[PDB]
Design a protein around this ligand. Structure first.
Ligand SMILES: *[C@@H]1O[C@H](CO)[C@@H](O[C@@H]2O[C@H](CO)[C@@H](O[C@@H]3O[C@H](CO)[C@@H](O)[C@H](O[C@H]4O[C@H](CO)[C@@H](O)[C@H](O)[C@@H]4O[C@H]4O[C@H](CO)[C@@H](O)[C@H](O)[C@@H]4O)[C@@H]3O)[C@H](O)[C@H]2NC(C)=O)[C@H](O)[C@H]1NC(C)=O
Ligand SMILES: *[C@@H]1O[C@H](CO)[C@@H](O[C@@H]2O[C@H](CO)[C@@H](O[C@@H]3O[C@H](CO)[C@@H](O)[C@H](O)[C@@H]3O)[C@H](O)[C@H]2NC(C)=O)[C@H](O)[C@H]1NC(C)=O
Ligand SMILES: *[C@@H]1O[C@H](CO)[C@@H](O[C@@H]2O[C@H](CO)[C@@H](O)[C@H](O)[C@H]2NC(C)=O)[C@H](O)[C@H]1NC(C)=O
Ligand SMILES: *[C@@H]1O[C@H](CO)[C@@H](O[C@@H]2O[C@H](CO)[C@@H](O)[C@H](O)[C@H]2NC(C)=O)[C@H](O)[C@H]1NC(C)=O
Ligand SMILES: *[C@@H]1O[C@H](CO)[C@@H](O[C@@H]2O[C@H](CO)[C@@H](O)[C@H](O)[C@H]2NC(C)=O)[C@H](O)[C@H]1NC(C)=O
Ligand SMILES: *[C@@H]1O[C@H](CO)[C@@H](O[C@@H]2O[C@H](CO)[C@@H](O)[C@H](O)[C@H]2NC(C)=O)[C@H](O)[C@H]1NC(C)=O
Ligand SMILES: *[C@@H]1O[C@H](CO)[C@@H](O[C@@H]2O[C@H](CO)[C@@H](O)[C@H](O)[C@H]2NC(C)=O)[C@H](O)[C@H]1NC(C)=O
Ligand SMILES: *[C@@H]1O[C@H](CO)[C@@H](O[C@@H]2O[C@H](CO)[C@@H](O)[C@H](O)[C@H]2NC(C)=O)[C@H](O)[C@H]1NC(C)=O
Ligand SMILES: *[C@@H]1O[C@H](CO)[C@@H](O[C@@H]2O[C@H](CO)[C@@H](O)[C@H](O)[C@H]2NC(C)=O)[C@H](O)[C@H]1NC(C)=O
Ligand SMILES: *[C@@H]1O[C@H](CO)[C@@H](O[C@@H]2O[C@H](CO)[C@@H](O)[C@H](O)[C@H]2NC(C)=O)[C@H](O)[C@H]1NC(C)=O
Ligand SMILES: *[C@@H]1O[C@H](CO)[C@@H](O)[C@H](O)[C@H]1NC(C)=O
Ligand SMILES: *[C@@H]1O[C@H](CO)[C@@H](O)[C@H](O)[C@H]1NC(C)=O
Ligand SMILES: *[C@@H]1O[C@H](CO)[C@@H](O)[C@H](O)[C@H]1NC(C)=O
Ligand SMILES: *[C@@H]1O[C@H](CO)[C@@H](O)[C@H](O)[C@H]1NC(C)=O
Ligand SMILES: *[C@@H]1O[C@H](CO)[C@@H](O)[C@H](O)[C@H]1NC(C)=O
Lengths: 441, 125, 126, 107, 75, 125
């Protein structure tokens, strides 16, 4: 009675979850745009009507791909640069006592040492200024990395500024984007669209604070893989930014020492004028309002009558303990102790000042045996940035106490990549299909 | 908005979605980063050639909507056309019948050769 | 053209009874669901009751459940609403509407009130 | 019963202005939401059904969109004949609840 | 190129005519002074501007023929 | 044993081997080691496309058995069908006829265009 016969259809709209390799799309720098495809001036997006998809930000291969690509680019950028192997020599250092305050005492060391020259016969005696975090006593001192590995000096012509990068899928695949506001990164998104490429993402490297990020369109958002478990980090996204102004006011001077044929080492000659600590400034009232919004949102998940505590970081390495970042090629580590210090109970123009310490020998990624030397920058440095998110970790969490304490977190940079690709997924099309029909060949 | 285009008919019914197969058909083809791009292009070309070969083996070469001689078994599906072509989406049907895919392919493949042999025999006379 | 005409409204005291009739033409009456809707003065629309094509399925809102009865005559293509124990809140304009089957752009079929009558006034005051 | 909430309650707009009316539901109703217009002393007239399909004969300026529990009616080019009370109705399950109505009048 | 040819329904053919009629607006010259009084390069240069429209017309025409063939075979 | 499958019909006669062309047709498509694998895949894709183009040029596109208009010359071979299709293997026939390969290809190529021209002329009326 049915007399139904099989029929083959090509081009059926069906997709399945899959993993593939995405490629560049962009409009001297570390993030090489030379080998990255030009971006279309008029990108196209197609809203899918009456289509609800499943999303989960904590199982995204895009984050891993981005991390691998960023690490590969960073490794590639440093290949054609000078290797500071001869620098591992016995230094003779003294304290700097020339126009310093009570907080910068012992921070700088004036060192002298012998070094090679272009000719392999002669030697030259030179001097330099080093930071206390870079020299370890063996009056005799040595570089911290000498007993681990010798790393290359970053070339002075490349720039560390982040450039937006768009990720595009290959032919036969598609990228689905969730346009549903108040979506918390896990569950069914009912509003979906297909996009040829991902919006511009700045690969900003920072810890304890998300800088120059994207802002929520509705209100403060809280995300976590398992909020009940304390071992899982909590990502907080603001709906408005907070301005932070970070400056190093020392007037540095750069000098070149010829250590070999076509090989120059850049050193800090001397500081002109006064010496004082670099520091950051953050608005107080804006920070208080942001923390009020954050605690209001946190009360939804962790009870209405609970006490919410913000305190200092537990401890560990300087990178995870302090807010680490860079400004104009100068690597800052700031002490964010005055911000996350307060208690909340259910019921003008002053600015918070964060002192910061500068570093030159850098191990950016969590790797051992590959450091990097940042050449000094000439003149004072200043910059302004937007705080648009936080990474928090719960302390304890046992049922014995009703007070919840949140502390700053960080360390793993994948989270910085997970705060931007939380509304994207990749699928592959399956055009072939079989159905019943009334035909007869 | 660009509601219609490529996958815009994903949420529509099968009857409505069958009218726009061409938009999906067109897009199936189109230093360290270059290697990844080349690998992706090679995989895409291989997938397209595999799909084209599978279509060709069944005798539906160069056709988007091609019916065949293999009859439909009621065991695989019991729903009638009344509640399928206008009361269901392609995604739902594919999810429902993802189990019973290969048998129909084999039946089509073995059916095509018999038709070819019969055509040769008829033309022999 | 679909035509619906209401009649039987007027003034009634609280606790009284009243019948509203709706004459329909221009379509297949037996194959269309019928809706009784009311609009109170100064308020929005509200669906009072619904009756199916066969006349066996009838539904009402909680505000009128147990007091309002909806019936249909397919032979005469007529619809009837009996109201009993009328209250002051029942005052307003009553419309008889047809739930017509329509096809969405995606290919799904549902029913909407695509045709309405002119309406009839009922005033429940002492 | 599913309750329907409209916004704004009332609005004053001039000829040629773009009018946007939002309608919200407590529970999902798929996309079975219909937008009607009412003039003074006249019965409601259907404009949108299915939350995105335009009724035959209606001018193209009227459009509808949305998903989940949020739907939007858009009048791109307000005309003298489009002033009145707009309502959004859900017809997924009985009872079919209407909105409180948005009144658009001449400024 | 093979996909573009196949989509129009001229798969496996070097000289394949189709159903879309020729619009006089695109070209006014007749066959008398085209097929034996002109070169392919000159014709392509003349009509390089109006390429995509005929492609779209062929694409939209092929599917109608396929649908009609299915409908006739349904009976 | 898996005697029957893929190339299992190599030792059988041409008539018996003509019933299993699809098993051969299916498999034709499918850090330092990856480069070699990619090169091999590129060569395989090129070979498959070459074979498909050669088949398409002769007008037997999308067909496994397709007899054509070119007559068989007795000079190339003298054995009759009686001692060929059931008294010989495909390898032996290819070995015997491998010298006479390109001429038939050219004849097919020049024959297809005449058929196309005649079809166009007939449809012109
Ligand atoms: C978040 O975003 C904000 C804004 O988008 C970022 O703040 C901006 O940061 C950039 C980079 O630091 C800064 O641009 C610099 O401005 C300086 C002052 O105008 C310039 O002097 C500087 O140019 C030097 O560096 C370039 C490479 O970056 C070189 O190409 C250029 O030639 C200059 O270098 C010369 O001078 C130096 C010093 O004398 C010398 O050593 C060199 O050899 C060479 O001779 C940059 O253009 C913007 O001004 C900042 N924006 C604002 C509003 O202040 C912020 O950094 C972002 N946050 C994070 C974490 O990245
Ligand atoms: C948007 O898509 C959804 C699903 O993809 C559509 O919901 C579907 O609506 C149809 C009505 O046409 C439902 O069919 C009904 O099924 C029940 C139970 O089988 C039956 O009793 C009814 O008579 C009717 O046939 C279908 O079940 C429903 N899908 C789901 C999953 O519930 C929706 O209609 C689409 N939007 C629009 C505007 O059409
Ligand atoms: C770091 O030490 C060097 C060497 O001791 C200082 O350079 C000397 O500066 C004095 C004047 O202050 C000169 O008289 C010497 O000739 C310099 N020595 C050489 C080798 O040039 C340098 O000034 C010190 N820098 C700081 C910041 O204290
Ligand atoms: C640079 O090299 C010179 C010569 O090798 C060093 O001077 C010698 O220092 C040692 C101390 O370990 C003495 O025993 C020698 O007598 C010194 N020789 C001369 C010629 O002075 C000098 O100390 C080196 N520079 C530094 C900073 O250590
Ligand atoms: C989130 O983490 C908690 C950790 O406590 C998970 O609950 C635990 O599950 C393990 C599994 O055997 C039990 O042994 C623990 O006793 C559980 N702890 C508590 C406090 O109940 C929880 O399952 C995680 N969430 C999800 C969705 O898996
Ligand atoms: C950060 O805030 C401090 C004050 O808490 C600023 O310190 C003042 O800086 C100005 C610079 O124009 C001086 O004139 C004042 O004498 C300073 N006062 C004090 C008490 O230090 C500091 O300049 C701010 N820095 C930034 C980058 O905004
Ligand atoms: C960070 O720097 C910006 C300017 O780079 C400051 O913006 C100034 O804010 C003051 C208010 O105290 C205004 O009077 C100025 O007109 C602003 N300048 C500009 C250029 O807009 C900002 O206040 C600084 N942030 C903090 C916390 O001090
Ligand atoms: C957060 O605050 C606590 C105390 O308020 C800091 O603890 C100090 O740590 C230094 C580091 O050696 C000690 O010298 C002090 O004695 C500690 N203070 C007390 C009261 O015990 C803690 O270091 C702060 N967090 C960070 C990241 O510095
Ligand atoms: C970050 O700042 C806090 C606040 O100044 C530091 O805590 C102080 O540490 C000093 C020791 O250097 C103690 O004498 C003070 O009593 C501490 N103050 C408080 C309120 O606890 C903290 O040490 C700084 N972080 C680091 C790594 O030094
Ligand atoms: C910090 O945030 C402000 C506010 O979002 C940014 O200022 C906006 O910049 C965008 C450029 O894409 C403009 O379209 C907006 O109109 C600006 N808004 C305001 C209120 O000025 C600012 O650019 C951000 N700073 C950085 C460095 O990203
Ligand atoms: C330098 O100063 C620091 C801190 O005042 C002190 O601990 C150190 O012994 C000093 N070194 C000298 C004077 O060589
Ligand atoms: C290098 O020296 C530091 C301090 O002297 C020590 O902590 C570190 O373990 C040493 N490196 C290795 C590889 O032992
Ligand atoms: C928020 O995340 C939880 C994680 O399990 C999920 O169950 C919930 O649906 C999410 N919220 C929304 C509105 O989707
Ligand atoms: C730093 O020193 C140089 C050299 O004397 C001078 O030209 C420059 O103005 C100084 N910078 C500031 C901010 O005063
Ligand atoms: C932390 O907050 C307390 C007030 O509860 C204040 O007394 C203390 O000085 C603060 N610490 C810092 C480092 O600002």
């Amino acid at each position: 009675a049915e007399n139904l016969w099989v029929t083959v259809y090509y081009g059926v709209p069906v997709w399945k979850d899959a993993e593939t390799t995405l490629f560049c799309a962009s409009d001297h720098n570390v993030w090489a745009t030379h080998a990255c495809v030009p971006t279309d001036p008029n990108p196209q997006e197609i809203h899918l009507e009456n289509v609800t998809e499943e999303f989960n930000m904590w199982k995204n291969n895009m984050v891993e791909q981005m991390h691998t690509d960023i690490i590969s680019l960073w490794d590639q950028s440093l290949k054609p640069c000078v290797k500071l192997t001869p620098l591992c020599v016995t230094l003779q250092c003294t304290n700097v006592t020339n126009n310093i305050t009570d907080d910068m005492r012992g921070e700088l060391k004036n060192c002298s040492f012998n070094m090679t020259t272009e000719l392999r016969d002669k030697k030259q005696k030179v001097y330099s200024l080093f930071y206390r975090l870079d020299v370890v006593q063996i009056k005799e001192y040595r570089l911290i990395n000498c007993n681990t590995s010798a790393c290359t000096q970053a070339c002075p012509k490349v720039s560390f500024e982040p450039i937006p990068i768009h990720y595009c899928a290959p032919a036969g695949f598609a990228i689905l984007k969730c346009k549903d506001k108040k979506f918390n990164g896990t569950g069914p998104c009912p509003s979906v669209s297909t996009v040829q490429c991902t919006h511009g993402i700045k690969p900003v490297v920072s810890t304890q604070l998300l800088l120059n990020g994207s802002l929520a369109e509705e209100e403060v958002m809280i995300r976590s893989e398992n909020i009940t478990n304390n071992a899982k980090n909590i990502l907080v996204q603001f709906n408005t930014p907070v301005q932070i102004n970070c400056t190093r006011p020392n007037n540095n001077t750069r000098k070149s020492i010829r250590i070999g044929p076509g090989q120059a080492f850049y050193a800090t000659g001397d500081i002109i004028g006064d010496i004082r600590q670099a520091h950051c400034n953050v608005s107080k009232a804006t920070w208080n309002e942001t923390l009020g919004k954050v605690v209001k949102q946190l009360r939804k998940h962790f009870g209405n009558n609970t006490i919410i505590r913000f305190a200092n970081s537990s401890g560990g390495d300087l990178e995870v303990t302090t807010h680490s970042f860079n400004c104009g090629g100068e690597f800052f580590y700031c002490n964010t102790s005055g911000l996350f210090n307060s208690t909340w109970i259910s019921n003008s123009n002053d600015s918070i000042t964060l002192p910061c310490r500068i570093k030159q020998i850098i191990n950016m990624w969590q790797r051992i045996g590959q450091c990097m030397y940042a050449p000094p920058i000439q003149g004072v440095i200043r910059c302004v940035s937007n705080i648009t998110g936080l990474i928090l970790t719960r302390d304890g969490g046992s049922t014995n106490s009703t007070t919840e304490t949140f502390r700053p977190g960080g360390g793993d940079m994948r989270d910085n990549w997970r705060s931007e690709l939380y509304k994207y997924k990749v699928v592959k099309i399956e055009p072939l299909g079989v159905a019943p029909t009334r035909c007869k060949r | 908005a660009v509601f219609l285009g490529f996958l815009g008919a994903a949420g529509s019914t099968m009857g409505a979605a069958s009218m726009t197969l061409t938009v999906q058909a067109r897009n199936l083809l189109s230093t360290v980063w270059g290697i990844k791009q080349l690998q992706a292009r090679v995989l895409a070309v291989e997938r397209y050639l595999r799909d084209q070969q599978l279509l060709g083996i069944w005798g539906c070469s160069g056709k988007l909507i091609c019916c065949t001689n293999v009859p439909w078994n009621s065991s695989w599906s019991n729903r009638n056309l009344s509640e399928i072509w206008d009361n269901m989406t392609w995604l739902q049907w594919d999810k429902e019948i993802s189990n019973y895919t290969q048998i129909i392919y084999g039946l089509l493949e073995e059916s095509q050769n018999q038709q070819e042999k019969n055509e040769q025999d008829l033309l022999a006379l | 053209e679909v035509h619906l005409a209401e009649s039987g409204g007027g003034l009634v005291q609280p606790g009284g009874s009243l019948r509203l009739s709706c004459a329909a033409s221009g379509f297949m009456f037996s194959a269309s669901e019928m809706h009784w809707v009311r609009q109170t003065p100064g308020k929005g629309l509200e669906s009072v009751s619904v009756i199916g094509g066969s006349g066996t399925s009838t539904q009402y809102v909680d505000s009128v459940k147990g007091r309002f009865t909806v019936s249909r005559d397919n032979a005469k293509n007529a619809l009837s609403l009996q109201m009993d124990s009328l209250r002051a809140e029942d005052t307003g304009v009553y419309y008889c509407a047809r739930g017509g089957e329509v096809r969405s752009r995606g290919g799904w079929k549902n029913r909407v009130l695509d045709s309405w009558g002119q309406g009839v006034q009922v005033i429940v005051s002492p | 019963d599913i309750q329907m909430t409209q916004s704004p309650s009332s609005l004053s707009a001039s000829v040629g202005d773009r009018v946007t009316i939002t309608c919200q539901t407590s529970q999902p109703v798929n996309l079975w939401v219909a937008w009607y217009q009412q003039k003074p002393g006249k019965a409601p007239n259907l404009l949108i059904f299915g939350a995105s399909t335009l009724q035959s004969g209606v001018p193209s300026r009227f459009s509808g969109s949305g998903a989940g529990t949020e739907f939007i009616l858009t009048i791109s080019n307000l005309q003298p004949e489009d002033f009145g009370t707009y309502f959004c109705q859900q017809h997924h399950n009985f009872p079919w609840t209407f909105g409180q109505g948005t009144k658009v009048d001449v400024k």
